[PDB]
Amino acid sequence: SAPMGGSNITIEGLVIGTKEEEGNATEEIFADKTFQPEPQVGEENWQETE
Amino acid sequence: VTTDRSQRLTLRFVPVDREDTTYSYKARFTLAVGDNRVLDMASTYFDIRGVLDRGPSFKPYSGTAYNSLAPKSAPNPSQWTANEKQTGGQPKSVTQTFGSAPMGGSNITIEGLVIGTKEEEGNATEEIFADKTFQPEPQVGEENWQETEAFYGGRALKKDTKMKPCYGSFARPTNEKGGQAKLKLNDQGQPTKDYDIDLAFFDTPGGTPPTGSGQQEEYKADIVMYTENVNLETPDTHVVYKPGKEDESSETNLTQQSMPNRPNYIGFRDNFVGLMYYNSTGNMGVLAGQASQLNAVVDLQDRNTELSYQLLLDSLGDRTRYFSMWNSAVDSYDPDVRIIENHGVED
Amino acid sequence: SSETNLTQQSMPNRPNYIGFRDNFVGLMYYNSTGNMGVLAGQASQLNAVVDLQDRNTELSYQLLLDSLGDRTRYFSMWNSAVDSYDPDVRIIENHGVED
Amino acid sequence: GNVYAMEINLQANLWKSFLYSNVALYLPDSYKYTPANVTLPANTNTYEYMNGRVVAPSLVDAYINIGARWSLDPMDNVNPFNHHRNAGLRYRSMLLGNGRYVPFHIQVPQKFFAIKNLLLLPGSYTYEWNFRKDVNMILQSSLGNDLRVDGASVRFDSVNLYATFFPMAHNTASTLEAMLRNDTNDQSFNDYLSAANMLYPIPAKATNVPISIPSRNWAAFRGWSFTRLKTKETPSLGSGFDPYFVYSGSIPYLDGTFYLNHTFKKVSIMFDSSVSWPGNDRLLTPNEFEIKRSVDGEGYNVAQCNMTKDWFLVQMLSHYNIGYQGFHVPEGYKDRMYSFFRNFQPMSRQVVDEINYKDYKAVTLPFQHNNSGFTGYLAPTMRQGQPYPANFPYPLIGQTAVPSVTQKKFLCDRVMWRIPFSSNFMSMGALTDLGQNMLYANSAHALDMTFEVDPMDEPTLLYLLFEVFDVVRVHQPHRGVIEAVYLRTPFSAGN
Amino acid sequence: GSIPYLDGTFYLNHTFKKVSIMFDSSVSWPGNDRLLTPNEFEIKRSVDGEGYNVAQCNMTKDWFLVQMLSHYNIGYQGFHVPEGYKDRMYSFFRNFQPMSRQVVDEINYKDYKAVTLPFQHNNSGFTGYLAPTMRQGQPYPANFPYPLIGQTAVPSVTQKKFLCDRVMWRIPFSSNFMSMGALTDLGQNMLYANSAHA
Amino acid sequence: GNVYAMEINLQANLWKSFLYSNVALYLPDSYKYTPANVTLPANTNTYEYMNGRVVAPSLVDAYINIGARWSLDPMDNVNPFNHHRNAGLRYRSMLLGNG
Amino acid sequence: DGASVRFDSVNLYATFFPMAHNTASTLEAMLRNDTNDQSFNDYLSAANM
Amino acid sequence: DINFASLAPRHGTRPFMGTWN
Amino acid sequence: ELPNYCFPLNGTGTNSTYQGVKVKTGQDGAEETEWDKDETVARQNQIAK
């Protein structure tokens, strides 16, 4: 199963968040494969949809 | 050994004087030991009558009284607004609903759900519509697992009643048959002699009937919900999670979830400790011969009467026996809660 | 047998323990002047028992045992095992649940 | 194929629902947090705060210290009587019924030692007493919140004095009076505690508390009792009201629930700044009562904890006269609810050896997982995640068991520590053999005492009881006359 | 079932209100102004103007005294728990159980409604309708019982009672109600029955 | 997303099953009823009557008198020893065996 | 409800301390004298209405 | 019931164990 | 005696989708097809029969 929801998927993996950078340069924050995605983390509620 | 004379066993003295104040009460008795008697002061006590308010922080049970079997994060059947909106040319701003319809029945009309019938003439058989003020009851539904009737109905909370998760939900009854709807008062503030209840009617979506057989007349009510506003409360729970700052009714707020409030027993202390002043010479008790008038008590600050009495009873008796008259019931804890002793589980 | 009868539902029957009474009370006749017991010297016919209607030997014995010992100890020879009830069933004591 | 089904572990859930409700919710506030988008009141002593703060269920989860008796280490310093599972308070709170609004009708007894057993001869006596309306003093709560804020209040509608009289034959009662008015036959009484009470402040995080009393007599001294209190859990008795008593849990100083006795390390006693006591080479550490030790080169621990051979002996001698000619369990009628061996709980556990186990990693709580997919993420709420091999705790058992170190401790939850001023520590009589020695009955010594203790991170009191005699004699020479004479000694209290 | 008269399981002792004793249709007993209500042993009272209740139930001061005196010689010179070897299974304090509860004030709570059992719902959708059978209905706010706690607590009245489930009430014909010896002091008074009292 | 699951309050069920089996089934007959289409014998003192009569679980439910020690008011006058939970009768019934 | 009972036999058992006969014959001779009548008292000791 | 025992014993042994006189 | 049940996280379980409808214009009470789709109410309400 794949519990960690996100915004996109690339060679760098799952996009778990974003930051402003320059407003035009907004960086995609990829999950650090050495510990993320954590197996104890998943969707907050039963209405569930990423 | 015993007198034959006409003489009481128990005397009760009311105060000759008293001083009720901001944080204390004082009283004076004339303790008349009559003649040809002796009084043992171990017989004596103060018979207090009064009233407590324990405040909103009191809770003498674990868990909740209301809907305790409900899954947490399950909502009350309920409504909100502006859910589906697809523009070109408008954000449409519809009403939207979630719920269930457990009351099966024979037909649906402007009057709502047909729950039954009567003969009238054999040809004139009257359709008995649910009395919306208390039918359909939420606690009535299909008798067995096999059945499913043709037409259905139930209740839901109108959009103005803000969501709470069903676990712990209470709302006071507003008629003798346990209906929960508010009386209307909306023109002027007197009750309008009627309930804030509307029928809402439903069919399968035009994306599931076959094409052409879903236009012109093909729409037909087969579910009805008696939507209402209620005096909703959660007297013994709180919302532990919700998906945003918004307190309002919305699709995401159906996913709120609640936890019961922490147990908080309140009562008088063991042996009523703390109730009287002792070892407190600004507030000292008095026993004086009424002619002599000089106090025989002579108490001190570096004495501890309440602990001395707690220790004494454990030397005189068995503190594990509770005794309501003196409010004696010694403080404890569960020893398996103090020292965890984790033997695992027999699974 | 029918499709609706598939939905029949059952409940277990109520528990009903049957056995002899505490100390075998009720088994022998006492204080019951139709059916009185006898202890007599075989020669001379005078019964030494001489019981009465307004006497209660069975309650008298039940009270005696509580003064002579601890009724919480069962003893199969005399069928001694005093009647009780669960105190949490007599006085409900509803502290709610830890859920 | 087989019928469709879903599986639950009941026995694991009946245990987690025990640990979370009975221990996780009682961990100190610094182990809790406030949920996303929730607003609490700033007054932490209030029910909405104590209730509004969430606790991650991974603290005190099903496996925590599995296999061992170990009280959790933050919990040793938490008041165990402020818990919803204590039967005595449940009973006392249910005796009034289930509502917040409660009229009441109660029989409060008289406790003052010079009166509580007294026989009054004929006469008219003015009797007064004064009573608190302060809810934090007169009520108790199982959380200990500030009821003067959280909305409790009390009103007295009437207070009446009852007296019950044995219906004595008048010629017998008129004789008994005439004998008890004679000054040969003064009734006399002794406060059961019979002590002088000192409270000394111990600042937050102080490990040492040195205290002294100046040169004075010690005639008929009995010994010391001592224990430790929190400052917020101790009301001021010197005033009509104490507005800074912002707490309503148990009051150990008043009610006997003493629960920090395990926090003492050592106490030493020194008369006249030279004359160490007990001196005379008595103990294995002659000049100090070493109550417990954190590391033990010589082997002076006992009872499979870290209490010492000296201290356990001093306690078993002072409570039960046991230690000389061998230890055994004291017979139950000499082992009351406030006795030592009734309350003494030694404990041991094993832990992963964070120094010598080379494959160790320091995983903090948010990164630990066990039951992932089947459990909420750091909250008592809907299950989150995926099934995955657990990364915590390291195993202490089986074929892959991890290198491990021992920890040892004790609890002692209703005692207060005793040291009899008796030449062999035994009770041979109420007036000891040192309290009538050639020295202490004659020459006025000064006393210096000092304690070493675990640091608390909140302000505490040493509660020190100098055990003395505290006696009254009561003479009733005429109708409606009471003369009463007090002597506490030593620490005589009047002129 | 059990036969209390034969086996000692007496369970209706809480149902007595008062008992009065009267010799020769004039000589009230114990008389002599003894009790707070001299002519009657008022076992319990439903309303208490003077404050004669005890033990945080509705049993009286007079009756509680008489029972503690007759079973344990305790009342004069103060009440305490009787020592365990003198407090057997058929004794008083072993069995005496005082109780209190709060109920909605059906007179002074103005928003009250009298919802009878078939119309009450709580755990609807998750519970069988008036039967120990399959769950019925829908999840919905519960309409019963009214809350007696929290901020929205409802006006309430207290109820008080006691139980005594193996005792049988006692009244010693002894001049002070105590047991001083098996032949009482009044029992070797009243030989005086030359007027033969009824 | 998260694993498919369904949620159950085990603690409320362990308490409701206690109250229903130990108190609801012992409420006097006037609180019970006869189910739809079920035929009981007219002799009320018989097992088929005592077992056939159904009791609404809403009487003595989980929230009844919550927070208080209170014996139910119809139960004060019900013989408490006529209960399946009394150890003395269980022992005396099991002493003779289970047949 | 169908219960019933049948008694197949009833026997009286008695147990005797094996007292020395010169002692028992002495005890009998003391207990037969009217000075030494055994006496008993019903434990309840009441008239029942 | 004023716990209605009242019985004969007030007894004791020799330099260990009894024969009477 | 009393059955224990296990229930979906959302309470109602497997919801089917429905659309709101209304009676046409009050012209008949001649029921069967004299209803029409209510545009004031969402086309995907979630309900369990």
Resolution in A: 3.3
Complete DSSP assignment for D215-240: EE--TT--EEEEEEEESTT----SSS
**Cis bond before residue G18 (omega within 30° of 0):** no
Residues of A in contact with D372 (CB under 8 A): 38-40
For strand B112-118 and strand B39-40, is the pairing parallel, antiparallel, or unpaired?
A: unpaired
Q: What type of residue sits at position B262?
A: R
Residues in chain A within 8 Å Cβ distance of I9: 46
Q: DSSP letter at D35?
A: P
| Chain A residues touching residue I10 (CB < 8 angstroms) | 46-47
**Residue whose structure tokens are 């669960």:** C86
Report which residue type is found at E50. E
Taking alpha carbons only, the member of B284, B303, B156 closest to residue D472 is B303
Name the 3-class secondary structure at E5. helix
Residues 65-124 of E with CB under 8 A from C: 88-90, 97, 99
DSSP state of I41: B
- The residue written with tokens 């009403």 in the block is B95
C-beta neighbour count of B295 within 10 angstroms: 16
Residue D245 DSSP class? -
Contact flag B260-C95 (C-beta cutoff 8 Å)? no
Spell out which residues of chain F touch residue B70, defining contact as CB-CB under 8 Å.
Answer: 9
Select from D381, D378, D374 the least CA-distant residue to D58: D378
To the nearest whole Å, the CA of C70 is away from the closest chain B CA by 18
Tell me how far apart the alpha carbons of residues F48 and F34 are, in angstroms, rounded to a whole number: 11
Q: What's the one-letter identity of residue B250?
A: S
Other CB atoms within a 10 A radius of the CB of residue E96 amount to: 21
Residue with tokens 């017979």: D331
Which residues 6+ apart lie within 8 Å of B151 measured at CB?
B104, B105, B106, B107, B108, B113, B114, B222, B223, B224
Whether D128 contacts B26, CB under 8 Å: yes
Beta strands in B211-297 (DSSP E): 223-228, 232-233, 237-241, 257-260, 266-268, 286-289
HSE of D284, CA atoms in CB hemisphere, 13 A: 18
Q: E10: which DSSP letter? A: -
Q: Where are the beta strands (DSSP E) in I1-49?
A: 7-8, 16-23, 35-37, 45-48
Which residues neighbour C70 within 8 Å (Cβ) at sequence distance 6 or greater? none
List phi, psi (to 5°) of E94.
Answer: -60, -35
What number of residues does chain E have? 198
Counting other chains too, the contacts that C25-34 makes at CB distance below 8 Å and 24 or more residues apart are C25/C58, C25/C61, C25/C62, C25/E3, C25/E6, C25/E7, C26/C58, C26/E3, C26/E6, C30/C55, C30/C57, C30/C58, C31/C55, C31/C56, C31/C57, C31/C58
Q: How far, CA to CA in Å, does B330 sit from each of B37, D132, G19? A: 36, 21, 55
Q: Which helix (H) or strand (E) holds D445?
A: strand D445-453
Tell me whether E181 touches chain B (CB under 8 Å).
no
Cα distance between residue D358 and residue D403, in whole Å: 9
The secondary structure of H1-21 as a DSSP string is -------------SSSS----
- Per the CB < 8 A criterion, the answer to whether I41 and B200 are in contact is yes
Chain F residue with CA closest to D94: the answer is F68
Q: How far apart are CA D332 and CA F38, in angstroms?
A: 60
Question: Is A46 in the I-facing interface, judged by CB distances under 8 Å?
Answer: yes
CB pairs under 8 A between D and E: 55
B60 to chain E: which residues are within 8 Å by CB? 149
Question: What is the enclosing helix (H) or strand (E) of D486?
Answer: strand D483-489
Picking from B34, B46, B44, B35, the residue whose alpha carbon sits closest to that of residue D163 is B44
* Of residues D60, D89, D144, the one with CA closest to residue D380: D60
Find the DSSP H helices in G1-49.
21-31
Answer for the pair B47, D159: CB distance below 8 angstroms, yes or no: yes
Q: Whole-angstrom Cα distance, residue B306 to residue D235? A: 13
Contact D203, D419 (CB under 8 A): no
CB half-sphere exposure, F16, CA atoms < 13 A: 26
- Asked whether D459 and D203 are in contact (CB, 8 A), the reply is yes
The candidate with the shortest Cα–Cα distance to B74, out of I13, F1, F13, E124, is I13
**Using CB atoms within 10 A of its CB, is residue D438 exposed (0-12), middle (13-18) or buried (19+)?**
exposed
Q: How far apart are CA C86 and CA F83, in angstroms?
A: 9
Distances (CA, A) of B134 to B143, B156, B347, E121: 19, 13, 46, 11
Strand intervals (E) in D110-221 = 119-120, 123-132, 139-141, 153-164, 187-190, 195-202, 208-216
Interchain proximity F63–B65, CB inside 8 Å: yes
CA distance to partner chain F, nearest, from residue E167 (Å):
14
Confirm if B149 and B107 have CB atoms less than 8 A apart: no
Interchain CB distance below 8 Å, E135 and I11: no
Chain H neighbours, 3+ Cβ pairs < 8 A: C, E, G
**Beta strand residue intervals within F1-99, DSSP E:** 6-7
Interface test with I, best of B85, B203, B218 (most I CBs within 10 A): B203
d(CA E114, CA C98): 31
Rounded distance between C-alpha atoms, residue B89 and residue D55, angstroms: 49
Residue D92 makes CB contacts below 8 A (sequence gap 6+) with: B265, B267, B268, B269, B270, B327, B329, D140
- Closest residue on chain H to G43 (Cα): H4
Quote the CA–CA distance of F30 and F52 in Å, as a whole number. Answer: 14
CB F56 within 8 A of CB I42: no
Chain C residue at shortest CA distance from F24: C89
List Cβ neighbours of E188 (8 Å cut-off, separation of 6 or more): none
CA dihedral F82→F85→F89→F90, nearest 10 degrees, is 150
Report the distance separating Cα B276 and Cα B298, nearest Å: 16
Choose among B231, B234, B230: nearest CA to B68: B234
SS3 I16: strand
For residue A30, the surrounding DSSP H or E stretch is strand A27-30
Tokens of E179: 């047991």
Q: Please name the residues in contact with B20: beta carbons below 8 A apart, sequence gap of 6 or more.
A: B26, D156
Closest-CA distance of chain A to residue I3, Å: 26
Tell which phi-psi region holds residue B342, choosing left (phi > 0), alpha (psi between -120 and 50) or beta.
beta
Distance CA E184, CA F76 (A): 35
Q: What type of residue sits at position E31?
A: G
CA pair distance F44, B77, nearest whole angstrom: 44
Could you say which of D91, D97, D384 has the minimum Cβ distance to residue F2?
A: D384
The amino acid at residue C11 is M
D113: which 2 tokens? 């030692």
Helices (H) and strands (E) in chain F, counts: 3, 1
**Dist. CA E102–CA E112, nearest whole Å:** 15
- Residue F18: its chain I contacts at CB < 8 A? none
Closest-approach residue (CA) in chain C for B72? C99
Facing residue for H6 by CB, picked from E172, E179, E182: E182
The enclosing H or E element of A18 equals strand A13-19
Residue D104: which of B327, B323, B273 has the closest Cα? B327
DSSP string, E22-78: EETTTEEES-TT-SSSTT-EE-B-S--SS--B-TTSSBBHHHHHHHHHHHHS-STT-
Q: How far is A50 from chain F (nearest CA, A)?
A: 8
Helix (H) or strand (E) holding B313: helix B305-316
Q: What amino acid occupies position E126? A: F
D463, containing H or E segment: strand D460-467
Interface of E with C in 123-142 (CB under 8 A): 132-134
Measured distance CA(C57)–CA(E9) in Å, rounded: 15
In contact, E140 and B156? CB cutoff 8 Å: no
Interchain contact, F13 vs B69, CB within 8 Å: yes
CB contact under 8 A, B201 and I22: yes
Find which of H1, H2, H3 to mutate to test the E interface (most E CBs within 10 Å of its CB).
H2
Cβ-proximal residues to D47 (8 Å cutoff; 6+ apart), any chain: B56, B57, B262, B264, D143, D145, D150
- Number of Cβ pairs < 8 A linking chain E and chain F: 58
From start to end of chain B, where are the E strands?
10-13, 17-20, 24-33, 39-40, 45-53, 78-81, 95-100, 103-105, 107-109, 112-118, 126-129, 151-157, 170-171, 197-203, 223-228, 232-233, 237-241, 257-260, 266-268, 286-289
User: What's the rounded Cα separation, in Å, for the pair E17 and B294?
Assistant: 46
| Matching residue, tokens 């794949």 | A2
Instruction: From F92, F86, E8, E7, select the one nearest C75 (Cα to Cα).
Output: F92
Interface of G with C in 4-43 (CB under 8 A): 42-43
Please indicate whether chains H and F are in contact, defined as at least 3 beta carbon pairs under 8 Å.
no
> For the residues of D52-114, what is the DSSP string, one character each?
HSB--TTTT-TTTTTTS----TTGGGS-TTSSTT-HHHHHHHHTT-S-SEEEEEEEEEP--TT
Q: Please report, for residues D30, D53, G14, G27, H21, the alpha-carbon distance to residue G18 in angstroms, rounded to integers and kept in the order given.
A: 79, 79, 12, 13, 21
> Helix or strand or coil: residue G25?
helix
Whether the CB-CB separation of F15 and C97 falls below 8 Å is answered with: yes
Contact E162, E59 (CB under 8 A): yes
Which residues does A contribute to its contact with B (CB < 8 Å)? Answer: 44-47
Identify from G36, G39, G43 which residue to disrupt to test chain H contact, counting H C-beta atoms within 10 A and taking the largest count.
Answer: G43
Give the residue from chain E lying closest to F54, CA to CA.
Answer: E131
Where is E19: in which H helix or E strand? Answer: strand E18-19
Q: Pairing mode, if any, of strands B95-100 and I45-48?
A: parallel
d(CA A42, CA F2): 6
Residue reference for tokens 């359909």: B136
Among C21, C67, C90, the residue with its CB nearest the CB of E7 is C21
Residue B43 makes CB contacts below 8 A (sequence gap 6+) with: D162, D163, D164, D165, E76, E77, E78
Which ranges of C1-99 does DSSP label H, i.e. alpha helix? 57-68, 87-90
Give me the residue label for tokens 């009770």.
D427
**Which DSSP string do the residues of D254-282 spell out, in sequence order?**
HH-----GGGEEEEEEEETTTEEES-TT-
Handedness of CA F91, F95, F98, G1 (dihedral sign): negative
CB contact under 8 A, G3 and C18: yes
What does the alpha-carbon distance between residue D455 and residue D204 come to, in Å, rounded to a whole number?
7
Contacts of E67 (CB under 8 A, 6+ apart): E92, E96, E169, E170
**Three-state DSSP class for residue D470:** strand
D472 Cα distance to chain centroid: 29
* Torsion B152-B157-B163-B168 (CA) sign: negative
Residues across chain B: 347
CA distance D414 to D336: 10
Identify each DSSP E strand in B90-166 by its residue range: 95-100, 103-105, 107-109, 112-118, 126-129, 151-157
Nearest-by-Cβ selection for I9 from D6, D8, D382: D382
D260 close to D228: Cβ distance less than 8 angstroms: yes
- Does H1 sit within 8 Å of G45, measured CB to CB? yes
* Helix axes of D10-22 and F10-22: crossing angle, nearest 10 degrees: 100
Amino acid residing at A17? G
Q: Are D475 and D187 in contact (CB under 8 A)?
A: no
Q: Of B221, B74, B227, B57, whose CA–CA distance to B136 is shortest?
A: B227
For chains G and H, count residue pairs whose Cβ atoms are closer than 8 Å.
Answer: 9
- Contact: E149, F67; criterion CB under 8 Å: yes
Question: Closest Cα partner for D245 from D142, D153, D100, D144?
Answer: D144
Name the nearest CA neighbour of B84 among I38, I17, I41.
I41
Q: Cis omega (within 30 of 0) on the bond before D235?
A: no
Q: Which of D173, D37, D154, D31 is nearest to D104 (CA)?
A: D154
- Measure CB to CB from residue D166 to each of E100, E148, E176 and give the nearest one: E176
Asked if residues D82 and D249 have their Cβ atoms less than 8 Å apart, the reply is yes
Residues near D117 by beta carbon (within 8 Å), at least 6 away in sequence = B40, B41, B42, D189
CB contact under 8 A, I9 and D8: no
The answer to whether the CB of I37 falls within 8 A of the CB of B219 is yes
Specify which residues D448 forms β-bridges with.
Answer: D212, D270
Give the strand pairing for B151-157 and B223-228. Answer: parallel
CA quadruple G48, H1, H2, H7: dihedral sign: positive
Structure tokens that stand for A39 in this block: 């197996």
* Chain E, chain H: beta-carbon pairs less than 8 Å apart: 5
CA dist D312 and D293 (Å) reads 12
Tokens of B312: 């004494």
Strand partners, B107: B114
List all residues 6 or more positions away from D214 whose beta carbon is below 8 Å from its beta carbon: D446
What distances in angstroms separate CA D190 from CA B284, B329, D279, D492, E16, one per listed residue? 19, 25, 32, 14, 44
Q: List all chains that touch chain F, counting a touch as 3 or more CB pairs closer than 8 Å.
A: A, B, C, D, E, I
> In 3-state terms, what secondary structure has residue B203?
strand
Interface test with G, best of C49, C56, C77 (most G CBs within 10 A): C56
